[PDB]
Each structure stands twice: as structure tokens, then as C-alpha cells.
Design a protein around this ligand. Structure first.
Ligand SMILES: *c1cc(F)c(C(=O)NCc2ccc(F)cc2)cc1C(=O)Nc1ccc(OC(F)F)cc1C
Lengths: 260, 11
């Protein structure tokens, strides 16, 4: 049976540490995204881009954080810039996971290099519903069918992210669950080219214990949710494979200030 | 680029 003992309390404090860091590193939380998407917020109502006329009007009315004549490339470039920002936020989050900054720096880089796309699919789900995706820190909303309407190869770029999100969002995870789930993904001891695997697995084992407890406490209706989330971490591996294949097609078939 | 941004963000 489950007991409230010193070990369980340490796992709750680890979970709370990760939640607080997650809130700090990712300003637009799932709770705030859901409130925007269900019209249950007093914050500013997002502008909806559902066709070319509303895109042209949105470019001018939505206030994008980034200063080609082709719509599909302008949108893909906005996508690229947002991913650079997300890599930074994810790296800031990783620095808060107990043990991570004490690992060999090369292994810190390798964990993040192979982890950030899995975490990007994960965090995009928080911003997605059946209709579309929140953009520009919640100031805009771009529809799933408008993205699908963009010419090849851009039209199929976001489709697998929506597909994943439909199934993932049905698990009804909250920010406390996601904080730990993302930390487990980052501390994957099977990334290619790691030098010192055991210390990574040691941290992951503690994170897995914390995740399991979080899901039992937070999800009374789903006894095997832990197993279901490990299944999603497995799915994200083959899905990122397909994402990087499509990124290479774009890099060599089509034409960020921090990158200089 | 990805590695460069990670090393930048880690420092
Ligand atoms: C859109 C376009 C795109 F090209 C990428 C991508 O993976 N580019 C590769 C790359 C190369 C170097 C580098 F430093 C980073 C990435 C990604 C996306 C995409 O998903 N954008 C994005 C990321 C995060 C989001 O929000 C939150 F994190 F979910 C939202 C969006 C639109």
C-alpha cells in the first residue's frame, strides 16, 4: 500500500521544485493556455488566422517578437524563431533539474540536443485544440486546416504535431504532471554519444519515482497512466525522427539574430 | 545551430 513517509515527501518536494522551475522557464503554462482556448480568461482574446485574408490582417494586428514574399516561408520562419526561443527556455528548465548541471558539460549538451524536439511536441500540445494552435504568447490562434492548406512541403509540417496532441491532450495532464514528464525525457541515458550514462540513469530513476507518485496522486481515474506516459515518450522518439527527416527536405529544397 | 544555442544558454 502507499504511505506518506520521508521518501514520498522528498518525491513531492522534487515535484514542487520542478513545477516552480517549469512556471519560471515557460511563461505560458498549460493552465493559462487552456483558459485562453476555452474563453475562460479575462486576458486579451486571441486574433484568429483561418484563411489568407486573416493571415495578411494578422501579420499587422498580432504583435510578433521577430522584427520572403511567400506566406508559407514567412510562417515557417516565424516557426523557426519560436523554436530557438523554446530551446533556450528548455535549457533554462534543464539547469534547475537536481543533478543536471553537475553532469559532464558535453553530456548536458547531448541530452538537450536529442531532447528538445520531443519536449517541443510535448509543449505544443498544451497550446493546441482540435481547431488550431495558440501563437505569439497567446495573442494569436492559427487553425489546423489553414496550416494544412499551405503548399508542399509546409502544409504537412504541423499535421503530425496535431495528431500527437489530440491523443496526448486526452490524458488531461496538468503543468505539475508535465514538469516531471519533461524532466524524465531530458534525463534519457540512451542518447547517442553520452560519456557517463550511470549518473544520468540515477537522476532519471528518481524522476520516474516522482512522476509515478505525481500521477497516482493527481489521476485517480487512470491507474496505468504512468505506463501510458512512458508509451508516449517511446512514440515521441519515432515522431521526432520523421520531424528531422522533413526539416532536411526543407533545408535542401527551399531557400535568428542570436545565431548571428 | 542547435548545439550553439544550447551551449550559449547553458553558460
Ligand atoms: C517550427 C519550425 C521549425 F523549423 C522548427 C525546427 O525544429 N527547426 C529546427 C531548429 C534548428 C535550430 C534550432 F536552434 C532550433 C530548431 C520548429 C518549429 C516549432 O515547433 N516551433 C515552435 C516551437 C515551440 C513552440 O512552443 C512551445 F514550446 F510549445 C511553438 C512553436 C511554433
Amino acid at each position: 500500500h502507499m504511505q506518506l513517509n520521508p521518501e514520498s515527501a522528498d518525491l513531492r518536494a522534487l515535484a514542487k521544485h520542478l513545477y516552480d522551475s517549469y512556471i519560471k522557464s515557460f511563461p505560458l503554462t498549460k493552465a493559462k493556455a487552456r483558459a485562453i482556448l476555452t474563453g475562460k480568461t479575462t486576458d486579451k482574446s486571441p486574433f484568429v488566422i483561418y484563411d489568407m485574408n486573416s493571415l495578411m490582417m494578422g501579420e499587422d494586428k498580432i504583435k510578433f517578437k521577430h522584427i520572403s514574399k511567400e506566406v508559407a516561408i514567412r510562417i515557417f520562419q516565424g516557426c523557426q524563431f519560436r523554436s530557438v526561443e523554446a530551446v533556450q527556455e528548455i535549457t533554462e528548465y534543464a539547469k534547475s533539474i537536481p543533478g543536471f548541471v553537475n553532469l559532464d558539460l558535453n553530456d548536458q549538451v547531448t541530452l538537450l540536443k536529442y531532447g528538445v524536439h520531443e519536449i517541443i511536441y510535448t509543449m505544443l500540445a498544451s497550446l493546441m485544440n482540435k481547431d488550431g494552435v495558440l501563437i505569439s504568447e497567446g495573442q494569436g490562434f492559427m487553425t489546423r486546416e489553414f496550416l494544412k492548406s499551405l503548399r508542399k512541403p509546409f502544409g504537412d509540417f504541423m499535421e503530425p504535431k496535431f495528431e500527437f496532441a489530440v491523443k496526448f491532450n486526452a490524458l488531461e495532464l496538468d503543468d505539475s504532471d508535465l514538469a516531471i514528464f519533461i524532466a524524465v525525457i531530458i534525463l534519457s541515458g540512451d542518447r547517442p554519444g553520452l560519456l557517463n550514462v550511470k549518473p544520468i540513469e540515477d537522476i532519471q530513476d528518481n524522476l520516474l519515482q516522482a512522476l509515478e507518485l505525481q500521477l497516482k496522486l493527481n489521476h485517480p481515474e487512470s491507474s496505468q497512466l504512468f505506463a501510458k506516459l512512458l508509451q508516449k515518450m517511446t512514440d515521441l522518439r519515432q515522431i521526432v525522427t520523421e520531424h528531422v527527416q522533413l526539416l532536411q527536405v526543407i533545408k535542401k529544397t527551399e531557400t535568428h539574430p542570436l545565431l548571428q | 545551430g542547435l548545439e550553439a544555442i544550447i551551449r550559449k544558454a547553458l553558460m
